Write a protein that binds this DNA or RNA. Structure first.
Ligand code: DTP
Ligand code: CA
Ligand code: CA
Ligand code: CA
Ligand code: CA
Ligand code: CA
Ligand code: CA
Ligand code: CA
Length: 901
DNA sequence: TCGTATAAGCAGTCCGCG
DNA sequence: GCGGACTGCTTAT
């Protein structure tokens, strides 16, 4: 096999590299890597190294890395550019792995771990580590085993061994239902004392040293706790055995308001799954507890136990260990689904970076562009200091708030990256500027042509047309990878719909799901077989189709994230290629393109309908337009259509055969006007929306910018078995809105779009009547809680105190003196409830940590004093009134003359 | 919330608005 | 009570 790195570190003048050798063996080497850096040199001198602008460079080879660093400093003191890759370990990887890396994941040791710590006096601070570690479950991907380290004897209780037999049993037999598929994979090691537990853990760690280290909150909790606990018990040198090169750093993470400490373990790549989830999942969650996320991702039941977690070990050690094991498995189950580790390895090896650098697109892109340029003996510029400066972004059209019955939307593919490619926007392709007319003049094609030589953006920038810049070249590669995976995702989605249809008529028979690749559109043969399957097989196939879709989603959406972040990096001061001229060139062209095509689509439709000045485009945001199709439907007449799918097909065909060609012509003209290198403004039909044929549904509505709902029949070539609500921006989509309220509002919107006003009034009346029965958690609002101390004046609300922060202050007073009560963590989320006048809490709201039941001593009081009226008016009625007035509908039946009978 | 970007919505405080 | 000025938070893109 081809060799690949696992981890790389710089330690003084040595590179420490763990890698897989040609035989598949894990090795470690120390290399006295001599880095090269570059300086500009005279034109006369003959060399093979040039900077990105074609200026000649001389290579300076340093006796060691510290010399290179010292040189960079002296170059700053002199006031001269020190060119080249200043992160020497990236240069080492580039030198050592000068080919496309092909990695074998089966050879990479992925460790998933979780620890337990009993604590009476509240949260066990990792930096203190004052309490014993009494359980560690460590899953190893190479052995495929859960190693369980169990403390039998503690100052907080002596306990009996965990029993694998009870662990396996159903909860109905008094067991813990540890999943039967892992029971055989558990290696249980009980211990008489904490020191031997920890010593053995370290010896184990040494034998099976993680390359990738993950888990849930491992970076913020488990790793620092284990490290500091071993430190406190044995000394630093022993704690540093967690690093394979015996080097660690206490790393301070700085944010806006305060800071925390993590431990950097050299020669390990820590990918904390919470952090992976937050970056790559594209969710915003009310809580980030593992139970909550597991429930959301996997539909698994919450881990059940009585009493505080501080008493679970001594009261039920059996359950204590089993839940520790299960918590580790849950992260693996989430990864089997979401596949973020796979993604991180793909991105990391592609860029030739430390795998943990996938969190940073700036680092990812710096390394991709460096390797790309190195290939041509080109030399990257030095990073520079820049002041943070605002710059303009996308255009968003102000919609007329209204119902909109028939809507067809159109969307530009991967817009910002396409702009970069079309215009040829790169640090080294800048050709100069041209005198800019107001944007409106370009949109209406009355402005003078910017250039007859260069490719232009309406911000005034001109770019070379002779060759592609390194940014277009490298963004195109990842764009093309994204395209492949999105193709797989949509095929899986279309395949899902095929299964949902067949599920309407399941066969009464025993059979097995078809062995198929859901990444490809089902053939005719597969379609026939599906029509003959049982519901049990169809459901398993639907589950599998949907897992394939999710896998594709991860792969495609995060490649899209990476390429859109390359645009965003052009507007970040820490990026090597930071240039506000390039960032603005991109955003300004985007603005032009959307308004240009709006004008075009309007002109085209006014023509085919034989009108003038009619607004067919009702809305647009950044890269997408929404076309009112009412007139198109009316031109054939609703009565001519057999069913919903009939007009959906007709619109599909109108969009494909008539509008897209007009849209294409309009963008090709704009490409010529701007003299761009390559036409890449590809705008395709996205959504087809409208009410069910023969219903009183309104189809869709907008309330304002970034706030709308559509009843969608077809999305990007996926014809739904059942219409799908596409709701953007409205309270149903906000994590701050109560769960039960999101669900109720969503159903109000469903009724509006699919059934009409009367149906809506039916549902509202019932919800209003019954809502006081809803679980308090389901009707709690959610908010992040920043700067709690700032607004805390002697335990009371300071000036301008935010409503949710007031809740927390109320809560804090209610749990005063109690170090066992859950504390609200700064920067984390809270549930928030209003409180009726004259409650014992002494204020108008209370807040407690999200994902949790509120502590038992105040629960009854909260439940008794909860202000249901305020709750209803704020989270439900106000948003609903917003929706309905926008749509010219009433949620309550207005009195009429018929009330006389 | 360490980790690419801007546009823009709504809740809530504070206080004006004769 | 509603709006603007502003903070806080959260979406859409
Ligand atoms: N997370 C982000 N970071 C930076 N820029 C973004 C981000 N999301 C969107 N944008 C900008 C760049 C995008 O090209 C543009 C429109 O985005 P969006 O409608 O999500 O899809 P897209 O056109 O980028 O890809 P596609 O439509 O192919 O899925 O807005
Ligand atoms: Ca736990
Ligand atoms: Ca699209
Ligand atoms: Ca798009
Ligand atoms: Ca059938
Ligand atoms: Ca879009
Ligand atoms: Ca097309
Ligand atoms: Ca009480």
């Amino acid at each position: 096999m081809k060799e690949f790195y696992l981890t790389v570190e710089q330690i003084g003048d040595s590179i420490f590299e763990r890698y897989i050798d040609s035989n598949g063996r894990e090795r470690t080497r120390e290399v006295e890597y001599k880095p090269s850096l570059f300086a500009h040199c005279p034109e006369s001198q003959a060399t093979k190294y040039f900077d990105i602008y074609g200026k000649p460079c001389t290579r300076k080879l340093f006796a060691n890395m510290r010399d290179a660093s010292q040189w960079i400093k002296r170059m700053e003191d002199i006031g001269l550019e020190a060119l080249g890759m200043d992160d020497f370990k990236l240069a080492y990887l580039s030198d050592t792995y000068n080919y496309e890396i092909k990695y074998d994941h089966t050879k990479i040791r992925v460790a998933n771990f979780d620890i337990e710590v009993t604590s009476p006096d509240g949260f066990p601070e990792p930096s203190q580590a004052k309490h014993p570690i009494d359980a560690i479950t460590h899953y190893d991907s190479i052995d495929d085993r859960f190693y369980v380290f169990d403390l039998l004897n503690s100052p907080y209780g002596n306990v009996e061994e965990w029993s694998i037999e009870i662990a396996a049993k159903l909860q109905e037999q008094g067991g813990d239902e540890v999943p039967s598929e892992i029971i055989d994979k558990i290696i249980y090691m009980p211990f008489d004392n904490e020191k031997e537990l920890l010593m053995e853990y370290l010896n184990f760690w040494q034998q099976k040293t993680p390359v990738i280290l993950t888990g849930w909150n491992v970076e913020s909790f488990a790793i620092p706790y284990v490290y500091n606990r071993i430190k406190n018990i044995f000394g630093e040198s022993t704690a540093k055995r967690l690093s394979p090169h015996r080097k660690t750093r206490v790393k301070v993470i700085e944010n806006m308001y305060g800071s925390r400490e993590i431990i950097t373990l050299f020669g390990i790549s820590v990918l904390d799954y919470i952090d992976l989830y937050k970056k790559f999942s594209f969710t915003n969650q009310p809580s980030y507890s593992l139970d909550y996320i597991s429930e959301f991702e996997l539909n698994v039941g919450k881990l059940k136990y009585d009493g505080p977690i501080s008493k679970l070990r001594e009261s039920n050690h059996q359950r204590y260990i089993s839940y520790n094991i299960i918590a580790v498995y849950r992260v693996l189950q989430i990864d089997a689904k979401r596949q973020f580790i796979n993604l991180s390895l793909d991105m990391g090896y592609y860029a030739k970076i430390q795998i943990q650098s996938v969190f940073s697109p700036i680092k990812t892109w710096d390394a991709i562009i460096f390797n790309s340029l190195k290939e041509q003996n080109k030399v990257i510029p030095q990073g520079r200091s820049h002041p943070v400066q605002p710059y303009p972004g996308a255009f968003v059209k102000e919609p007329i708030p209204n119902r909109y019955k028939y809507v067809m939307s159109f969307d530009l593919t991967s817009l910002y990256p396409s702009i970069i490619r079309q215009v040829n926007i790169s640090p080294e392709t800048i050709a100069g500027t041209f005198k800019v007319a107001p944007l409106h003049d370009y949109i209406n094609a009355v402005a003078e042509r910017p250039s007859d030589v260069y490719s232009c953006s309406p911000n005034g920038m001109m770019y070379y047309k002779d060759r592609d810049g390194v940014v277009p070249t490298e963004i195109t590669k990842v764009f093309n990878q994204r395209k492949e995976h999105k193709g797989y995702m949509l095929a899986a989605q279309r395949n899902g719909e095929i299964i949902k249809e067949a599920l309407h008529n399941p066969n009464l028979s025993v059979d097995e799901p078809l062995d198929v690749d859901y990444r490809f559109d089902f053939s005719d043969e597969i379609k026939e077989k599906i029509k003959k399957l049982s519901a049990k097989s169809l459901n398993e196939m639907l589950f599998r189709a949907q897992r394939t879709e999710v896998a594709g989603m991860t792969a495609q959406i995060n490649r899209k994230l990476l390429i859109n972040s390359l645009y965003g990096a052009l507007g970040n001061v820490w990026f090597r290629y930071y240039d506000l001229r390039n960032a603005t060139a991109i955003t300004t062209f985007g603005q032009m393109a959307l308004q240009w095509i709006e004008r075009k689509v309007n002109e085209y439709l006014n023509e085919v309908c034989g009108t003038e000045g009619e607004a067919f485009v009702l809305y647009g945001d950044t890269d997408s337009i929404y076309v009112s199709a009412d007139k198109i439907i009316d031109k054939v007449g609703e009565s001519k259509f057999r069913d919903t799918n009939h007009w959906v097909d007709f619109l599909d065909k109108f969009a494909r055969e008539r509008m897209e060609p007009a849209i294409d012509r309009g963008f090709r003209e704009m490409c010529e006007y701007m003299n761009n290198k390559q036409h890449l403004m590809f705008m395709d039909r996205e959504a087809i929306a409208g009410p069910p044929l023969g219903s009183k549904g309104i189809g869709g509505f907008w309330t304002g910018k970034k706030r709308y709902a559509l009843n969608v029949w077809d999305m990007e070539g996926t014809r739904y078995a059942e219409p799908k609500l596409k709701i953007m921006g409205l309270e149903t989509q906000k994590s701050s809105t109560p769960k039960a309220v999101q669900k109720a509002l969503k159903e109000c919107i469903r009724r509006m779009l699919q059934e009409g006003e009367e149906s809506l009034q039916e549902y509202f009346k019932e919800f209003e009547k019954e809502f006081r029965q809803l679980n308090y958690i389901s009707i709690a609002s959610v908010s992040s809680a920043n700067n709690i101390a700032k607004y805390d004046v002697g335990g009371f609300p300071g000036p301008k105190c935010p409503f949710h922060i007031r809740g927390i202050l109320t809560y804090n007073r209610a749990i005063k003196g109690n170090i066992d009560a859950p504390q609200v963590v700064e920067g984390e989320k809270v549930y928030v409830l209003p409180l009726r006048e004259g409650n014992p809490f002494g204020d108008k709201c209370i807040a407690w940590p999200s994902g949790t039941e509120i502590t038992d001593l105040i629960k009854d009081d909260v439940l008794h004093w909860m202000d249901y009226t305020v709750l209803l008016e704020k989270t439900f009625i106000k948003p609903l009134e917003g929706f309905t007035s926008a749509a010219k509908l009433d949620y309550e039946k207005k009195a009429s003359l018929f009330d006389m009978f």
